[PDB]
Amino acid sequence: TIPHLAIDPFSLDFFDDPYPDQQTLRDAGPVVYLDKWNVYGVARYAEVHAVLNDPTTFCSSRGVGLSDFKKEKPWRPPSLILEADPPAHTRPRAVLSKVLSPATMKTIRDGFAAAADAKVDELLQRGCIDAIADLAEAYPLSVFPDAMGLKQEGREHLLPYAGLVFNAFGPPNELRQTAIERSAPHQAYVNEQCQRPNLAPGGFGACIHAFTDTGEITPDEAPLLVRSLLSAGLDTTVNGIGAAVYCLARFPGELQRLRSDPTLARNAFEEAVRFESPVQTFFRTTTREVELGGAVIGEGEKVLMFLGSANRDPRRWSDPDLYDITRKTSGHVGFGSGVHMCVGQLVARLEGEVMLSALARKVAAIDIDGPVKRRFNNTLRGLESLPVKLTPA
Numbered sequence: 001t002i003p004h005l006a007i008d009p010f011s012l013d014f015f016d017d018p019y020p021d022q023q024t025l026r027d028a029g030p031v032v033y034l035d036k037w038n039v040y041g042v043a044r045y046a047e048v049h050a051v052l053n054d055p056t057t058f059c060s061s062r063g064v065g066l067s068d069f070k071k072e073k074p075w076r077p078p079s080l081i082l083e084a085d086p087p088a089h090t091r092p093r094a095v096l097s098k099v100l101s102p103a104t105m106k107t108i109r110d111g112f113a114a115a116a117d118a119k120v121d122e123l124l125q126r127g128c129i130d131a132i133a134d135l136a137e138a139y140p141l142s143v144f145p146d147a148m149g150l151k152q153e154g155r156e157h158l159l160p161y162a163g164l165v166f167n168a169f170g171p172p173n174e175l176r177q178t179a180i181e182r183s184a185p186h187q188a189y190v191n192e193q194c195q196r197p198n199l200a201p202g203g204f205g206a207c208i209h210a211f212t213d214t215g216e217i218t219p220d221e222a223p224l225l226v227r228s229l230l231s232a233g234l235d236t237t238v239n240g241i242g243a244a245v246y247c248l249a250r251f252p253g254e255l256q257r258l259r260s261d262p263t264l265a266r267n268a269f270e271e272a273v274r275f276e277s278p279v280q281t282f283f284r285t286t287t288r289e290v291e292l293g294g295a296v297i298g299e300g301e302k303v304l305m306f307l308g309s310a311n312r313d314p315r316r317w318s319d320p321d322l323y324d325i326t327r328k329t330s331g332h333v334g335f336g337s338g339v340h341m342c343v344g345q346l347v348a349r350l351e352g353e354v355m356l357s358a359l360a361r362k363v364a365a366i367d368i369d370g371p372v373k374r375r376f377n378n379t380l381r382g383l384e385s386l387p388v389k390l391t392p393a
């Protein structure tokens with residue numbers, strides 16, 4: 001009753017161009033079985049949204065990667081937030097929500113915006129730049145480690161660590177195994193910076209430790225919650241901003257609309273998240289036999305969600321394959337949905353907004369002027385190199 005497909009959603013061929021295979025997965029049925037990895041798959045918006053919004057049946061505490069923590073040992077101690085279900089999830093979630101809250105955004109917005117403006121001015125002086133290394137990477141590296149309260153030394157470990165985290169949600173293919181083989185120095189750096197003495201006053205890390213006396217988290221929980229921000233808080237935004245610039249380079253008509261109304265910057269970034277979902281896939285595990293879309297899935301089964309596919313499903317979106325900065329993006333799943341929906345989304349949106357605002361006000365054209373190279377990761381989607389010429393406004 002459930003179609004079986006041989007598509008490998010963690011192959012380089014899939015990463016190179018996932019859209020035809022995603023349509024194949026959507027059109028095969030609401031629920032598919034992926035023989036390559038012995039997991040169920042859901043690629044339509046309706047089922048992805050339903051799975052995300054039933055955490056009791058589709059749990060996260062057995063891992064949101066291929067590995068089932070009930071069968072195999074996690075490669076690192078489980079996350080107290082991502083890899084937790086309610087009720088254990090609830091108070092750590094509440095702490096990170098307050099740390100990454102509107103009030104915090106107000107304290108950091110001016111500095112984040114100045115840094116975006118300054119970066120665009122710098123890039124305009126160079127003219128020809130790599131929008132990944134020089135912009136998508138450089139801008140978040142210029143604001144987020146400092147907002148965390150990290151020392152300067154060792155920040156070169158942050159992107160490798162995140163690439164490891166997101167590769168480790170995949171199956172035991174070469175991307176994952178190579179990442180784990182090389183991981184020891186990055187893990188050692190990250191774990192050490194999670195300790196309260198290594199996090200500067202006023203930053204996100206220190207704020208997490210300052211929440212350890214309310215009864216929400218204990219002091220021994222705070223280093224792992226800092227670890228969560230050092231895992232998810234940088235590489236995601238690198239790929240999101242890279243996606244937005246890639247979209248504006250490929251859709252010059254939308255760059256021109258954005259120039260004419262820079263207050264579209266925040267929605268232009270949100271549409272980039274929908275269109276080029278930086279996080280493409282991850283898993284849940286069933287806690288019982290469950291009927292989904294008309295198929296019966298047994299207990300203890302991994303269910304792979306295709307977030308990028310759900311965000312391009314024509315059952316939900318009009319012209320899903322168009323980048324439209326005035327689209328009503330409400331409901332996209334690029335930040336997830338439900339109780340685990342990205343707790344850092346206000347930081348992500350702030351970065352993306354202020355960067356796209358700076359481009360809207362300062363740049364007249366973005367022209368690809370060199371070979372574009374993709375960066376392969378088991379769950380993140382984005383580019384390795386994006387050579388562009390920036391023309392000043």
Ligand code: HEM
Binds near residue numbers: 096234340345348
């Ligand atoms: C464009 C940038 C980003 C994207 C696309 C993104 C995407 C996501 C998604 C899809 C989830 C849901 C995971 C799940 O349901 O299992 C999530 C959760 C999470 N994200 Fe984000 N994220 C971004 C930026 C950030 C930032 C900047 C931070 C921190 C500063 C962050 C921290 C987290 C954390 C801690 C969780 C787990 C929340 C929970 O389990 O309750 N993310 N993110």
Ligand SMILES: O=C(O)c1ccc(-c2ccccc2)cc1
Binds near residue numbers: 080083165228232
């Ligand atoms: O370490 C964490 O808590 C953490 C790691 C990865 C993520 C993540 C974000 C988006 C998609 C999948 C996973 C969230 C939290």
Ligand SMILES: [Cl-]
Binds near residue numbers: 076190191
């Ligand atoms: Cl670690």
